Amino acid sequence: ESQYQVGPLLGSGGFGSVYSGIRVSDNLPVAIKHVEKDRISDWGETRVPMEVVLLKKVSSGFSGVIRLLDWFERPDSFVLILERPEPVQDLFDFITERGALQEELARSFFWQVLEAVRHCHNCGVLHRDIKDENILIDLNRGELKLIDFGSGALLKDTVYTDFDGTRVYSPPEWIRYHRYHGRSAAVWSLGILLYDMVCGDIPFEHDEEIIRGQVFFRQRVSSECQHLIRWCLALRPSDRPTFEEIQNHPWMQDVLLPQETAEIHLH
Numbered sequence: 001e002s003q004y005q006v007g008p009l010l011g012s013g014g015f016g017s018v019y020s021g022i023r024v025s026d027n028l029p030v031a032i033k034h035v036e037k038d039r040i041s042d043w044g045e046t047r048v049p050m051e052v053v054l055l056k057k058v059s060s061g062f063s064g065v066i067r068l069l070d071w072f073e074r075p076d077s078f079v080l081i082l083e084r085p086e087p088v089q090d091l092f093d094f095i096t097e098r099g100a101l102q103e104e105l106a107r108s109f110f111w112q113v114l115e116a117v118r119h120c121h122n123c124g125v126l127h128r129d130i131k132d133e134n135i136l137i138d139l140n141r142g143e144l145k146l147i148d149f150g151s152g153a154l155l156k157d158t159v160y161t162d163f164d165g166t167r168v169y170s171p172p173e174w175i176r177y178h179r180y181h182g183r184s185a186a187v188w189s190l191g192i193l194l195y196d197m198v199c200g201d202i203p204f205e206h207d208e209e210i211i212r213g214q215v216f217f218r219q220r221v222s223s224e225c226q227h228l229i230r231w232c233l234a235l236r237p238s239d240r241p242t243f244e245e246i247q248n249h250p251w252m253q254d255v256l257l258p259q260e261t262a263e264i265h266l267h
């Protein structure tokens with residue numbers, strides 16, 4: 001309220017309205033997200049939005065996830081105070097600017113995404129909306145951060161039959177049956193993400209292309225990378241790699257450190 005100073009609006013959309021801000025007590029940069037109460041389909045716990053439940057569960061120390069520093073309730077909205085890296089650029093803008101990414105950069109990014117998703121999973125949290133728009137690059141440190149847990153859920157081992165993340169990243173089993181399990185669905189979205197990184201765009205726009213699962217490469221991409229991608233994008237959920245299999249894949253060997261990454265690629 002007076003505990004933060006509000007700057008420019010960063011973005012608005014189905015995640016709410018996020019402003020650039022500064023914590024007055026110690027000038028920490030922050031991002032202040034406002035979500036309207038009647039836009040919240042999903043609540044946990046007094047009653048908070050699921051997004052706050054999920055962020056509290058993952059906001060312990062390891063930094064591949066955006067940290068929730070505080071939250072407030074207002075009469076028609078909740079306000080979430082989040083970390084803000086500075087300078088920062090979301091992966092989607094970064095890809096718009098730079099086109100398809102060199103493999104070495106896509107490997108570093110993709111690895112950090114996997115560490116972040118493993119950490120969420122370990123904390124009992126399923127993101128359900130992994131995509132370039134939901135990933136922030138701290139451009140000085142070369143560290144990626146997962147944001148926008150507003151479509152996530154507690155991780156469980158039984159089937160999910162609800163989804164509200166991004167359709168073009170949702171797996172064929174969700175398209176056809178409205179059913180998925182959390183890990184394998186997460187893995188498919190990671191396949192879409194990785195294709196997006198290396199080709200400069202997502203592979204499928206239409207339901208039919210998702211269902212068909214046939215991957216055409218429009219950029220030059222190494223065989224090992226194409227094979228990882230096709231593996232993550234297996235039609236049968238149980239034919240997809242576990243996180244361990246993805247990180248042990250030959251295309252994932254020799255990842256740059258985040259800091260090396262920023263020096264080489266983010267200048």
Ligand SMILES: Oc1ccc(Cl)cc1-c1cc[nH]n1
Nearest residue numbers: 011015018031082083084147
């Ligand atoms: O959640 C965020 C945290 C930090 C920054 Cl810089 C931005 C966001 C953000 C921007 C759109 N959704 N979430």
